[PDB]
Scaffold this active site. Structure first.
Site, PDB file in Angstrom:
ATOM      1  N   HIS A   1       0.810  -1.237   0.000  1.00  0.00           N
ATOM      2  CA  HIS A   1       0.000   0.000   0.000  1.00  0.00           C
ATOM      3  C   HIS A   1       0.836   1.277   0.000  1.00  0.00           C
ATOM      4  O   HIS A   1       0.505   2.248  -0.694  1.00  0.00           O
ATOM      5  CB  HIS A   1      -0.947   0.019   1.210  1.00  0.00           C
TER       6      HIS A   1
ATOM      7  N   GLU B   1      -4.500  -4.113  -1.946  1.00  0.00           N
ATOM      8  CA  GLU B   1      -3.896  -2.789  -2.076  1.00  0.00           C
ATOM      9  C   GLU B   1      -2.431  -2.825  -2.506  1.00  0.00           C
ATOM     10  O   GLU B   1      -1.548  -2.328  -1.812  1.00  0.00           O
ATOM     11  CB  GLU B   1      -4.124  -1.970  -0.790  1.00  0.00           C
TER      12      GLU B   1
ATOM     13  N   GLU C   1     -14.674  -4.962   0.410  1.00  0.00           N
ATOM     14  CA  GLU C   1     -14.814  -4.168   1.643  1.00  0.00           C
ATOM     15  C   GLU C   1     -15.922  -3.133   1.491  1.00  0.00           C
ATOM     16  O   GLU C   1     -16.008  -2.447   0.466  1.00  0.00           O
ATOM     17  CB  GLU C   1     -13.494  -3.473   2.001  1.00  0.00           C
ATOM     18  N   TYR C   2     -16.783  -3.030   2.503  1.00  0.00           N
ATOM     19  CA  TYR C   2     -17.847  -2.024   2.493  1.00  0.00           C
ATOM     20  C   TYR C   2     -18.364  -1.754   3.904  1.00  0.00           C
ATOM     21  O   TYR C   2     -18.052  -2.498   4.844  1.00  0.00           O
ATOM     22  CB  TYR C   2     -18.988  -2.417   1.530  1.00  0.00           C
TER      23      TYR C   2
ATOM     24  N   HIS D   1     -17.754   0.610   6.364  1.00  0.00           N
ATOM     25  CA  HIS D   1     -16.656   0.743   7.321  1.00  0.00           C
ATOM     26  C   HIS D   1     -17.183   1.013   8.735  1.00  0.00           C
ATOM     27  O   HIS D   1     -17.729   2.088   9.017  1.00  0.00           O
ATOM     28  CB  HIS D   1     -15.714   1.855   6.853  1.00  0.00           C
TER      29      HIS D   1
ATOM     30  N   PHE E   1      -7.384   4.375  14.009  1.00  0.00           N
ATOM     31  CA  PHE E   1      -7.818   3.830  12.724  1.00  0.00           C
ATOM     32  C   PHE E   1      -7.702   2.304  12.621  1.00  0.00           C
ATOM     33  O   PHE E   1      -8.139   1.717  11.624  1.00  0.00           O
ATOM     34  CB  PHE E   1      -7.134   4.536  11.544  1.00  0.00           C
TER      35      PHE E   1
HETATM   36 NA    NA Z   1      -8.123   0.415   9.634  1.00  0.00          NA
END
Ligand code: NA
Ligand SMILES: O=C1O[C@H](CO)[C@H](O)[C@H](O)[C@H]1O
Ligand SMILES: [Mg+2]
Ligand code: NA
Lengths: 211, 210
Positions: free
Chosen positions: A26, A69, A145-146, A148, A209
């Site tokens: 990434h 990624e 991914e969806y 969040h 995060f």
């Molecule tokens: Na994260």
């Protein structure tokens, strides 16, 4: 690839599994700097080939993934084809480079919205409903991914599900994610508390995060 | 004296169940046409293009009726306003199409057109095609003609394209209707409708349902 017991449990309890190679690059600029480089094809190949060799007999594994990624490089296309040749029993997906590249059997975007386009240069995230019907497109769409789920979240979750039920080729997705990556630390009184990035003197860090 | 007996209802009525006033009569134009014995009986105009539309070929197929003779010719001329941009002349006798030969009563003319002015609703560029049936030595027998619009319509990769560009149809269905004259149409009404349509950002019309 997960701990070997995970697949045994998914076989016996009944869950569909996407088995994913340990390849994420990434932080590279651009993201495909290593994955488009033939010098890195050997290292990438081993992370894909050795996973397939290990996990190919598990019924729970239904889809192979080339990683996450790492942009889209020629190495992805080479390894996509390797899997298709060695194991025709499972589709191969990969999201890098715009979620609908030649290295994926499934349109598998991350955080593409239901109705709203996000037209980023080179790697747009189309409305999922719109994405299915782009000129020439025929593949199923399942978001890798969806929704969040960070803190007080999952607003608009019902909108995805209404769309999934309405559109045959919208076949669902994987929420991000299951469990907060918080770690236990202890205060002056030995009481445990939930810690995140930066709480271990780690710097630079991305704070909450991970949750 | 002509006598015309018009039936309101026929077996044809079973194919004419449009959601509209049911009327009857001689409701469009009646004309008398004189054609020579040796005549143009049909013509088709096609325009094909290269990849960027900078070159076109106009292909005109012309059919005749009458007695076939060696001296007969067709000249197709194409005009951009007052300028003749292309022209071609040939005797009758089409290419071989099967084991029995070809159409001795047909001819196809092919005209090259460089940088054709393209037709669209946005810019309705038109050329004039004149089809001349004549003796080789210069006697015009008769001429027919049409307006030619240089445009390609194709569906590619799921999109309707006009001159290689995807259309957005701002369309309306339009019946032939007048509050005083019923289903009789006149030029003034037609022009009034087209004006109002274009003034209101329409670029397309469906002939509902005939
Ligand atoms: Na994260
Ligand atoms: O389905 C239709 O809807 C219209 C309703 O006015 C009209 O009947 C049209 O002729 C018909 O095709
Ligand atoms: Mg009807
Ligand atoms: Na669906």
């Amino acid at each position: 690839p997960n701990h070997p017991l995970w697949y045994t449990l998914c076989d016996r309890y009944g869950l569909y599994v996407v088995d994913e190679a340990n390849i994420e690059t990434h932080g590279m600029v651009p993201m495909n700097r290593l994955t488009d480089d033939p010098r890195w094809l050997p290292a990438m190949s081993e992370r894909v080939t050795r996973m397939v060799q290990r996990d190919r007999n598990h019924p729970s594994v239904i889809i192979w993934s080339l990683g996450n990624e790492s942009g889209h490089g020629a190495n992805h296309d080479a390894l996509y084809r390797w899997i298709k040749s060695v194991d025709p029993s499972r589709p191969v997906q990969y999201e890098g480079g715009g979620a609908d590249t030649t290295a994926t059997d499934i349109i598998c975007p991350m955080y593409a919205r239901v109705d709203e386009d996000q037209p980023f240069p080179a790697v747009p995230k189309w409305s999922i409903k719109k994405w299915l019907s782009l000129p020439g497109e025929t593949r199923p769409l399942i978001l890798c991914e969806y929704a969040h789920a960070m803190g007080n979240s999952l607003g608009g979750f019902a909108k995805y599900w209404q769309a999934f039920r309405q559109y045959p080729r919208l076949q669902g997705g994987f929420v991000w994610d299951w469990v907060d990556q918080s770690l236990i630390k202890y205060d002056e009184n030995g009481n445990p508390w939930s810690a995140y990035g930066g709480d271990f003197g780690d710097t630079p860090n991305d704070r909450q995060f991970c949750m | 004296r002509l006598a015309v007996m018009v039936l309101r209802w026929s077996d044809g009525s079973y194919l004419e169940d449009q959601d509209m006033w049911r009327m009857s009569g001689i409701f469009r134009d009646v004309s008398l046409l004189h054609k020579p014995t040796t005549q143009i009986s049909d013509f088709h105009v096609a325009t094909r293009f290269n990849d960027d539309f900078s070159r076109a070929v106009l292909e005109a197929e012309v059919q005749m009726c009458g007695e076939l003779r060696d001296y007969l010719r067709v000249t197709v001329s194409l005009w951009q306003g007052e300028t003749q941009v292309a022209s071609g002349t040939a005797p009758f006798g089409g290419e071989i199409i099967d084991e029995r030969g070809g159409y001795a009563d047909r001819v196809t003319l092919r005209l090259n057109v460089e940088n054709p002015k393209l037709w669209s609703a946005e810019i309705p560029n038109l050329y004039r095609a004149v089809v001349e049936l004549h003796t080789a030595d210069g006697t015009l027998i008769e001429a027919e003609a049409c307006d030619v619009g240089f445009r390609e319509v194709r569906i590619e990769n799921g999109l309707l394209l006009l001159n290689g560009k995807p259309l957005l149809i701002r369309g309306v269905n339009r019946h032939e209707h007048h509050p005083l004259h019923g289903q009789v149409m006149d030029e003034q009404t037609m022009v009034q409708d087209i004006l109002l349509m274009k003034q209101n950002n329409f670029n397309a019309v469906r002939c509902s349902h005939y």
